[PDB]
Subunit: 338 residues, 5 copies
């Protein structure tokens, strides 16, 4: 995630101008390889046309260039590109909106589950670590960065997310499907045992705890849904062929023809096709942001910091349910008292 | 469902290029028959024009070709195509979002419904199988793959979704409407009997169970709504006529005329209309993805794996409510304990 | 409602082609009268130009035709047409999504309200018929088909939706506003009396019943809102004038001029303006689907089957709350038992 | 609000044609003044060009007219107009969706709050009038029609919405912010007193009452948000300048030049610019509907009937909580009994 | 926030015309610096071309100007500009919709938490100030105006939002993440202590209080999400390069060439490029509103008045929970009594 919100707080003179001098998360970083390939191909074709070709073959190439430049507009690159990018951005913000945050649940665990002894501490930590374990189990499946941090469940044991007893229980409960749902059933059964044991005073608190847990379950299920059900491959293939064919055509039709021939539209012979390179910038950059936000759980600069979210959720939850349980600041009159 | 999310985790050099070499769920698989028909018709017309036609008829065909090529832009294929595809994609993701998952409900069943004896086991399995039976009853109606797996309710009896007593009860309760709603009333009555029998300790747990069941009912009702209320047939007919008329016009207007006549725009005579074939690719592929995602419960490569979802839901629910009821891993201090 | 979902389950060779041979809910049925009027006007103008007009008046008509054909693009028919149709489709699916279904409420009535005697039967049937009566009272106001089935509340008495006592009470409570909200207050008071009488064991069940009833109230209020607050008449007038002016211009500018005059763009003289008729097809069909989905509760082929929904809701609710109350299939071990 | 839903129930021959003969809520009523001003300016410029100008100044004006007509397409009126109108319509339906309806709350008040004596009557009427008073307090701030009906809170006292005791209490609680939130705190405290006094039997009913009241609070807060946070003035200025500059350019560039000069595109000299007037119709009407739906609480023909909503809510709520409390129709078997 | 809702209540003759004479929140205020820079560059280039350049260099500049003006349409400024502005506006209204309002929670605190003594007063004020402290802690992080008002937590102590005991507790609980979530855990623990101490009579009221608090937590988490996860920097860079390249091209291609050369399209030599300046107005103003609404928590004229919201929330909450607790107006019959 590249954050520049503080730099664009106010609309000032050239507020977006200072953002053009960035490299992390920039469009130049996503575009330089493709632009170098396109530049090399364009200038190789130019050197073939200007030097290698015989005059009749030069005339044939000029006719081909005019033919390709006159029909470049037949390719609806803007249409499919806009549809694809709109869908990608909608799915991207929906994928972020379904990232689970245990803050409501950890507040309810710190409040409802009573006991300042070691047993209540253990119970609260186990419940909120069940929540965090389910979250990290779904993030291990939907994110390549989290999977590279935790290649196996034993790495989750070494990271304090899973106890060896939980690892053995999860290996015992193995099925040919993903096992991210198991900590939710564990949470339900442990909360029922806590209520039956007197640690939870009323079943309405149990209902609130399980409602927050089920909201987290729905968010994790939506994450699994977005990881499994991708944008249809046909859309990706169509938009890729659109952009690639558009600029493969521009490799020939946007060549600067011989000004001695006095072709209409080719009177001035420049070396650098500034407008064609700007079109490459815009369209291929649109394609590259589609390629970057299609899976926002990878390891791109603008992809989500899911490892940081995992660590923050674990640390904050364990602080909230253990050190902050019935640990309140002294209740004193405020400044506006009477 | 064709999944390629892991292949596009990072925006790399030609990340979408490697996706062009796929066949399952590809646009070539959806386009090859139509493209072969279009190619055959185009080259038959070309061979008729170049060989069979008399010179005056060739002049008439050239005038007709210019007339058709000058007015190809009168057809708003992009407009109706974009509207139709946007509506199809919105409805497609809404249809996936309303696929029922019993995970919240099965967690509540494993927690609230008490009893490690055979009667509590039977009660929990019957409740969660009522949920799964309602889900499979609506998926039998909205999905052709599930209907091919279960042509009748007796096939659901052979698959363990329905007991013969439930089959007899459902045959007794027959009405001229769909009977997918019956297991929800069964769930409500059985949960009421469980609460009155002491298996459910508090009615707030009963309320939570029935709230999850009613959420599943709303999702299944939305599935039935999307199956019943299709996109209006007028839209499909209009977009089909748009694409078909566009490329039936291109069958004539995009023909390469005789370069000896020196027509404006037909100076260079190629054999393969690369731009016309690219337009066919893009537009007819847009139409084909509309045809593929219009009913995402069929048996296309990119259609939902509803049989897998049915099997996974049944297996996971029966594991969660029976083997995982009050079966917790040993509660031990974690790595960050004190 | 025209359903063709099963016919488009798989993307096959010409899947949308077989849908062009339909008549119910087709675009030809919505377009034939307007197309015949347009055809008659176009050919009357053609016969006036080719035969009735003097040569100088023919020259004036040719200049007028060129003037109208050169400025046909000044009319933004696609812009307003797309905005209007998108709004119509969004409102159409929102109107369907707010059609009340009493299934959750009838499950809660069959579960919570106890008593297998005649008094409990009467209570459950009265509650669920209050729900159905409110639904049919709002559908009588928002739908012309339901209003033609029930021109008065006495027709609702003859249809079993309302008892004569309820009809007298509703006549007594008459106000100059719509009285669809009355059965909700009746439901609340009757549920309170049921809870105070011991028929409902806990007030949490009362809360669940009234929550489902209030959800139905919100859906019916949204239906009343969509019936009352129409799309602003200015939008309809603007889009109608756009389409009508576009094709009134095409009545003159799309005429085939005399090829002897050798006008640019009018070299070939056909009889049938295929492209103009295709444009009429697409644009006027877009307008006609806007006209058909603007009020989806009428009696069009693609309009909702609201009478069927009313009958199904009444029948299913009365079956669920009366014959299915505490009437469960025998609870027996399933196939996967141990 | 102009309602024509019943007139467009069925898609008939010229269904939208009959809507062109309306005046209330019509586009002619919103467009006639601007169209008369544009017509007067256009014909004044025409009379200056044809009569007042010297021949050299006529040549200069012809060159200026060609220059303006060739660059009329540089103004993206359709782009900003579509964005602005889409945003306006979305905000308009969101503003209607957040209009508070007390029907759910009044049903809960008629049910939960017990007592057929004068004290229970007073309590129920006071609670539902607190709800209606909060609604009318926010509508007095967001609507100019409601503010013209009630210029002060004393007018609300004269209208029965506020008692003099409530007016004195609200004057005592005065702060430099809007005081529409006060009746919600009044409702909460009065409901707590009702529950503590035995009028509300269980606190779950208290929770339901306060949940409905808080939903009304959220709707009124959204109304206050839409009144306060307008569409940014920059958007309005940009779209207004776009339309005004487009048609100020059309005042010169769309003039009919002298046909004796034989200018290309100005061969035929008409008097009425039909296409320019149609463009004015469409674009300026789009602007006028943006001007009409930007604040849907004013006194336009298509603006909301907020005074009617206020009166209906007050009357219906006072009928529901007072005359309909425990006043049920006789519970008798229906037509389908056994 | 610039409010003009009352000025556009009715669609009158030139309703949007009076809004063009504004300066605060106007497009001229956002555009004058860029327009002056563009004007200076354009006229410097004009003076170089008309005076400094030799005749051959003037011919070269004329050819370059024609080349740039013929390919200005290759830049899709409207496409990326519309996508970016639509995304910005959607995110802007979503950011406003997640601004926390404690009105529902403060009503529940004033109702549920009993006690007119000093201890109940202290408890209610502490709970609602926990809510306001969490809100101001997230607004200090997402808003530069709130951060300039409160550069440190000691400034929050001086502003009455935080007691020194709370400041010490928050310093003790310091972690390398944002600490806005702490007052929610404080609220949960204090509400649990209030319920255990008898101040809250039933745990259902505790559930309602914590549900409102958790809704506020979700809103603040969404605010933190929008502050952290910005629009990807690639989009901003692409749209900025699009606008800047478009008008850097217009700096050369929109120059008025020598009319003596009689170039096609440059016959009339004006001094002021009115159409180019209008295009700058529209497109650069679209870019500037994107720059202004990208972070709506800064200090722009149209940015949110977050300091006012903070002050109003604090004042209104402290009035509602302290002075309005069990302080009701006298319950008397209204005007429509019997
Ligand atoms: Ca990525
Ligand atoms: Ca399919
Ligand atoms: Ca209709
Ligand atoms: Ca208005
Ligand atoms: Ca800002």
């Amino acid at each position: 995630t590249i954050t520049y919100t503080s730099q664009v707080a106010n609309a000032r003179l050239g507020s977006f101008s200072r953002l053009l001098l960035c490299w992390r998360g920039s469009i130049y970083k996503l575009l330089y390889g493709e632009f170098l390939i396109f530049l090399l191909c364009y200038y190789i074709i130019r050197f073939i046309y200007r030097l290698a070709l015989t005059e009749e073959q030069q005339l044939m190439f000029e006719k081909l260039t005019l033919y390709c430049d006159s029909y470049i507009q037949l390719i609806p690159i803007s249409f499919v590109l806009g549809f694809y990018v709109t869908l990608v951005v909608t799915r991207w913000w929906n994928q972020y909106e379904n990232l689970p945050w245990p803050d409501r649940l950890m507040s309810l665990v710190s409040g409802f589950v009573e006991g300042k002894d070691e047993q209540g501490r253990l119970l609260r930590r186990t419940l909120i670590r069940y929540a965090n374990l389910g979250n990290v189990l779904i993030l291990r499946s939907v994110s390549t960065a989290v999977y590279k941090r935790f290649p196996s469940a034993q790495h989750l044991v070494q990271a304090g997310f899973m106890t060896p007893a939980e690892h053995k229980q999860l290996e015992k409960l193995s099925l040919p499907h993903n096992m991210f749902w198991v900590p939710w059933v564990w949470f339900a059964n442990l909360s029922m045992k806590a209520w039956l044991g007197g640690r939870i005073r009323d079943p309405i608190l149990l209902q609130s705890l399980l409602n927050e847990m089920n909201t987290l379950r729905t968010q994790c299920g939506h994450l699994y849904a977005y990881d499994w059900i991708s944008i249809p491959l046909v859309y990706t293939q169509v938009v890729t062929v659109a952009v690639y064919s558009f600029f493969l055509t521009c490799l020939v039709g946007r060549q600067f023809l011989n000004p001695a021939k006095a072709y209409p539209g080719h009177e001035l012979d420049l070396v650098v096709p500034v407008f064609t390179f700007l079109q490459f910038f815009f369209y291929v950059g649109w394609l590259k942001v589609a390629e970057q936000l299609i899976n926002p759980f990878g390891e791109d600069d603008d992809d989500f910091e899911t490892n940081w979210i995992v660590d923050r959720n674990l640390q904050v939850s364990l602080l909230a349910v253990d050190e902050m349980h019935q640990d309140l600041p002294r209740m004193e009159p405020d400044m506006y008292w009477n």
